[PDB]
Amino acid sequence: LDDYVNTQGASLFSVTKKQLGAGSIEECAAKCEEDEEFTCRAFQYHSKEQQCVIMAENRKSSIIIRMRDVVLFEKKVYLSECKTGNGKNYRGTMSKTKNGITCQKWSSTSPHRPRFSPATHPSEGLEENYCRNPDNDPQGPWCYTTDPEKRYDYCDILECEEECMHCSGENYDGKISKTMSGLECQAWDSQSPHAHGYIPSKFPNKNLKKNYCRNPDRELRPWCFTTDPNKRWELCDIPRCTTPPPSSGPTYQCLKGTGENYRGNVAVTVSGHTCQHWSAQTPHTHNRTPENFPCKNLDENYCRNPDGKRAPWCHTTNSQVRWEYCKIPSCDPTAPPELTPVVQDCYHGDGQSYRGTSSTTTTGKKCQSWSSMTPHRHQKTPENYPNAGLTMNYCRNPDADKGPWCFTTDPSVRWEYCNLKKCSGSEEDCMFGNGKGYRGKRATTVTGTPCQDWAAQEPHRHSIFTPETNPRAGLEKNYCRNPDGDVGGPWCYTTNPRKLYDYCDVPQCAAPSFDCGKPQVEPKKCPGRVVGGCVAHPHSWPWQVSLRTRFGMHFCGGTLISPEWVLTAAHCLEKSPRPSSYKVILGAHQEVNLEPHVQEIEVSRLFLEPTRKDIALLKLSSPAVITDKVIPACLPSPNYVVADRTECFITGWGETFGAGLLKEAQLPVIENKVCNRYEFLNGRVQSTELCAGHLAGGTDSCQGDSGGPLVCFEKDKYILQGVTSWGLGCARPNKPGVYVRVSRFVTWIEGVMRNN
Numbered sequence: 003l004d005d006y007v008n009t010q011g012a013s014l015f016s017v018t019k020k021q022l023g024a025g026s027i028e029e030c031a032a033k034c035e036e037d038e039e040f041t042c043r044a045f046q047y048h049s050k051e052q053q054c055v056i057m058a059e060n061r062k063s064s065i066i067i068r069m070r071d072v073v074l075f076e077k078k079v080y081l082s083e084c085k086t087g088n089g090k091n092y093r094g095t096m097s098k099t100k101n102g103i104t105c106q107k108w109s110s111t112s113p114h115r116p117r118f119s120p121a122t123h124p125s126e127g128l129e130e131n132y133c134r135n136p137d138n139d140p141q142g143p144w145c146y147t148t149d150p151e152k153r154y155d156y157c158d159i160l161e162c163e164e165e166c167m168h169c170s171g172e173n174y175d176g177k178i179s180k181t182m183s184g185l186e187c188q189a190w191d192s193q194s195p196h197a198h199g200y201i202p203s204k205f206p207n208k209n210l211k212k213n214y215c216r217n218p219d220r221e222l223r224p225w226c227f228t229t230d231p232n233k234r235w236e237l238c239d240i241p242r243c244t245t246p247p248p249s250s251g252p253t254y255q256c257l258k259g260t261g262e263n264y265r266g267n268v269a270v271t272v273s274g275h276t277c278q279h280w281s282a283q284t285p286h287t288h289n290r291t292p293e294n295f296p297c298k299n300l301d302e303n304y305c306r307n308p309d310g311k312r313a314p315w316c317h318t319t320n321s322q323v324r325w326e327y328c329k330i331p332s333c334d335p336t337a338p339p340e341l342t343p344v345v346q347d348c349y350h351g352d353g354q355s356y357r358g359t360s361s362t363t364t365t366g367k368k369c370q371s372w373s374s375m376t377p378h379r380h381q382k383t384p385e386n387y388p389n390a391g392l393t394m395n396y397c398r399n400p401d402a403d404k405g406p407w408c409f410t411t412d413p414s415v416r417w418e419y420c421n422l423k424k425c426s427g428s429e430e431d432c433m434f435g436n437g438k439g440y441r442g443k444r445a446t447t448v449t450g451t452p453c454q455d456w457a458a459q460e461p462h463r464h465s466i467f468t469p470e471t472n473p474r475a476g477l478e479k480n481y482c483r484n485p486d487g488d489v490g491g492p493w494c495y496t497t498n499p500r501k502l503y504d505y506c507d508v509p510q511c512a513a514p515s516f517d518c519g520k521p522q523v524e525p526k527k528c529p530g531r532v533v534g535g536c537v538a539h540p541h542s543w544p545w546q547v548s549l550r551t552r553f554g555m556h557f558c559g560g561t562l563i564s565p566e567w568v569l570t571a572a573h574c575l576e577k578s579p580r581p582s583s584y585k586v587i588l589g590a591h592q593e594v595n596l597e598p599h600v601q602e603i604e605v606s607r608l609f610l611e612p613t614r615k616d617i618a619l620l621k622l623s624s625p626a627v628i629t630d631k632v633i634p635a636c637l638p639s640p641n642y643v644v645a646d647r648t649e650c651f652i653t654g655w656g657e658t659f660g661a662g663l664l665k666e667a668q669l670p671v672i673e674n675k676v677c678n679r680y681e682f683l684n685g686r687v688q689s690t691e692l693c694a695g696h697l698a699g700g701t702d703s704c705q706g707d708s709g710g711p712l713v714c715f716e717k718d719k720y721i722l723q724g725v726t727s728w729g730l731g732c733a734r735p736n737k738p739g740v741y742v743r744v745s746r747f748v749t750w751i752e753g754v755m756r757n758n
């Protein structure tokens with residue numbers, strides 16, 4: 003199944019097809035390789051129905067429609083518009099020669115009579131008028147031309163990035179799993195021996211498969227994390243292709259937009275200064291080299307825009323001016339913010355009326371924008387559905403499904419139901435999450451159709467999901483169960499012979515207490531662009547602590563992690579060596595003019611981290627009362643590394659608009675590897691440290707309070723990922739802030755709370 007591209011919840015419209023019963027995907031794949039009546043380009047497998055659909059079409063020739071109980075598997079060769087070697091196995095759609103002449107059909111005998119046709123060579127894929135290599139020609143794929151004067155000619159086809167690489171290897175698809183020094187690559191899905199933020203589920207379009215060398219972070223060339231415990235990562239020796247790189251789109255010798263497509267010959271700045279050659283390091287040293295930007299055309303000293311600036315620019319030959327924009331003669335999309343409500347949104351009926359900001363699925367996947375056709379091509383547009391409210395990447399129900407859904411950013415999963423509950427307005431008859439462990443008595447589908455018994459084989463026959471085949475699944479009578487971890491939750495086979503299965507609405511079990519990282523007041527979610535942050539909504543960060551002096555002044559921040567425990571920075575408690583000199587304020591919004599019902603607790607014990615890091619544990623003299631305004635924060639799993647580009651929040655009062663009020667600021671997490679680059683922190687950031695802030699457009703201020711929280715949203719809650727420490731490094735211009743990585747101290751924190 004390495005020769006296939008899989009997509010869950012995807013199906014195509016097929017004319018040339020063959021349907022048959024199959025027990026597995028592998029069994030269905032074997033029938034596709036057989037090629038009985040036609041050449042199988044894709045197959046569909048229905049796990050609950052045990053049905054196998056073999057097809058002659060794929061996404062290039064057929065329309066994609068979302069469906070339940072389906073995984074679409076497409077043969078990689080029929081999707082790849084590139085060649086490997088002499089293009090013997092090439093199956094792309096290039097239908098013109100290297101000189102622009104349209105190809106003749108392999109089945110046609112006019113203007114030329116073929117020597118190679120589907121009749122003479124049936125295993126050579128001589129389809130339509132596509133360029134092919136059926137005669138082992140060393141010059142590569144060719145075609146018979148429509149020109150009667152030219153019998154046949156070779157075609158210009160891009161080389162696959164399998165044997166070699168183009169540019170920086172950002173689109174490298176080869177199988178090299180060894181570094182330049184001979185170390186074995188660590189699998190991208192693995193967090194051992196090295197914990198990292200390049201999580202494939204968080205970057206599903208970056209092709210981080212197995213332990214292959216990849217370039218997901220604009221590095222010089224593909225690299226990987228190593229299996230050696232002492233070497234975190236290393237570059238790979240990937241060969242460069244000798245053939246031209248992929249097309250960067252239309253090129254203009256005049257200014258258009260930002261000038262990223264500008265390829266003119268202007269070698270003078272806006273102030274008349276002579277441009278410094280991109281290949282030169284005098285009088286100015288830089289990393290905007292042809293080696294770092296190989297497909298950006300940094301040739302000679304011509305004005306270019308490789309790093310995404312305002313207009314095409316160049317370095318200056320004058321020692322005083324480093325760089326300046328160029329006066330080029332003019333000629334006449336990013337990821338949306340995380341606005342998923344932490345106070346879980348609800349839907350009425352089928353959720354067609356739902357207009358909330360949720361963009362999270364039941365498995366924690368990110369919703370694709372309705373205006374976007376990538377990674378999933380669809381027709382669910384605001385033009386086709388004007389009353390469905392298909393705005394941004396929000397969870398909606400345009401085609402009247404059981405509940406709100408969205409297309410996912412994961413190319414291997416077309417769509418998923420959203421993480422929303424049915425509005426409330428047997429109590430024990432409830433479930434947790436998707437309800438795999440659910441053993442209740444509900445047997446009513448969303449449509450009202452009665453459930454078929456699990457042991458029953460009529461109207462639907464099934465060799466899977468019977469009490470004998472799944473004995474730990476609790477498949478009793480016709481009760482709605484989730485034995486396969488279905489996204490839509492518990493389901494049952496239906497008594498309707500026209501409907502295989504259907505979902506049953508099972509409510510979520512009510513939380514008996516205020517669980518960690520779940521505020522009772524929805525956070526404002528201050529946009530990242532905002533200067534000096536925003537004033538937080540009162541009680542939207544219930545774990546926020548105010549460390550107070552014996553004269554009642556707020557000096558430091560902190561996080562409530564347990565009713566008797568507060569996590570802060572060691573720097574905060576440097577001045578005084580007594581826990582009696584510090585007091586903890588909980589459920590506050592005001593820095594000075596504290597509102598009534600705020601919790602004031604004395605500190606009884608202080609625990610400093612043994613490896614001398616800027617992190618400290620405070621034991622409260624009495625346990626804090628957990629209310630709707632005072633809730634602890636969740637701690638991450640030991641050594642967890644927050645994914646790169648993850649938007650996090652830093653909260654506190656700070657030193658000062660909104661005087662003496664609790665503030666918040668959104669910061670993107672920068673992976674230690676990117677953070678440790680010579681242009682930024684230059685190898686100073688250790689595994690015990692976290693990088694958050696902007697690499698371009700720095701605020702130039704020590705944000706929040708010292709010891710303050712850094713929380714990151716994950717599916718349905720906020721997890722404490724960092725502790726504010728100004729000593730490590732403040733948010734400078736073009737330099738991110740350095741925070742204490744909480745996950746590296748979780749084992750120590752757990753030990754202290756357990757034994758004290």
Ligand SMILES: *[C@@H]1O[C@H](CO)[C@@H](O)[C@H](O[C@@H]2O[C@H](CO)[C@H](O)[C@H](O[C@]3(C(=O)O)C[C@H](O)[C@@H](NC(C)=O)[C@H]([C@H](O)[C@H](O)CO)O3)[C@H]2O)[C@H]1NC(C)=O
Binds near residue numbers: 336393394
């Ligand atoms: C991508 O990242 C940048 C930060 O680097 C965010 O600002 C950006 O949001 C959009 O940023 C642009 C500025 O470039 C505008 O502020 C934008 O608004 C508009 C637009 O004119 O581009 C307004 C328009 O009404 C929107 N359409 C709606 C609401 O239906 C479009 C639309 O959202 C966008 O074109 C889709 O790409 O945007 C901010 O949306 C980040 N991108 C997103 C989608 O948030």
Ligand SMILES: [Cl-]
Binds near residue numbers: 066067380382
């Ligand atoms: Cl669809």
Ligand SMILES: [Cl-]
Binds near residue numbers: 204
């Ligand atoms: Cl991605």
Ligand SMILES: [Cl-]
Binds near residue numbers: 600
């Ligand atoms: Cl207050």
Ligand SMILES: [Cl-]
Binds near residue numbers: 234674675678
């Ligand atoms: Cl690193």
Ligand SMILES: [K+]
Binds near residue numbers: 220
């Ligand atoms: K690069």
